Paper text:
PabB catalyzes the amination of chorismate (Cho) to 4-amino-4-deoxy-chorismate, which is a committed step in folic acid biosynthesis. GATs comprise minimally a glutaminase that produces ammonia, which reacts with a synthase-bound substrate to yield specific nitrogen-containing products.
Finally, we assessed whether a catalytically competent conformation of the glutaminase active site requires rigidification by the presence of the synthase subunit PabB, by determining an additional crystal structure of the separate PabA subunit. Indeed, a comparison of these structures reveals a significant increase in ordering of the glutaminase active site in the presence of PabB due to reduced conformational variability of several interface PabA loops, which is required to generate a catalytically competent arrangement of the two catalytic triad residues aH168 and aE170. While we found only residual glutaminase activity in separate PabA, the catalytic glutaminase efficiency kcat/KMGln of the ADCS complex in the presence of Mg2+ and Cho was 1.09 ± 0.13 mM−1s−1, which is similar to previously reported data.
Author numbering: -1 to 187
Write the structure that this text describes.
Amino acid sequence: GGMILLIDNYDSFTWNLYQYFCELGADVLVKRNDALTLADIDALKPQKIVISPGPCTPDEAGISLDVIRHYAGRLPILGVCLGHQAMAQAFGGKVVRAAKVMHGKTSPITHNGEGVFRGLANPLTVTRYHSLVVEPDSLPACFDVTAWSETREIMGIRHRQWDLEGVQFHPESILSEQGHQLLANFLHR
């Protein structure tokens, strides 16, 4: 509810998330993936963690993979794009090339109306900034898929037991009412 650790994986969109979460009344702290150890995060005492997008892959995302693996089941974690892929890979996921690389287009995904999608319209139009996707047949059994592209891509995953959730699209909203309601869902679990 209070203190959010946002992990910057060197994207401009981490500051959008900063503003969005601050407008929802959260105490947010933004630390770069290479300027942190896991010992650091114990000092900061976060209530929830968010892994940002970034131009890299999870392997090159500094501590992101280490953080998901160590804090899984201790604090809620929300992965956006890169963070969503990092969440799959963390539990033995496989990230593969997409059918079409999307550099800013908005498109309709279907969801299960649970997790961050509770009280959201289905289908839902979202904006995509990615070229890679989580491979469905490789997805670890600990994860349910929660959203699908219309080309049948994984657009959201969620752990079956713990509070860690991913989205492949950029939430980009909080003045959209159904965009505010998506991040508020993570914040007020």
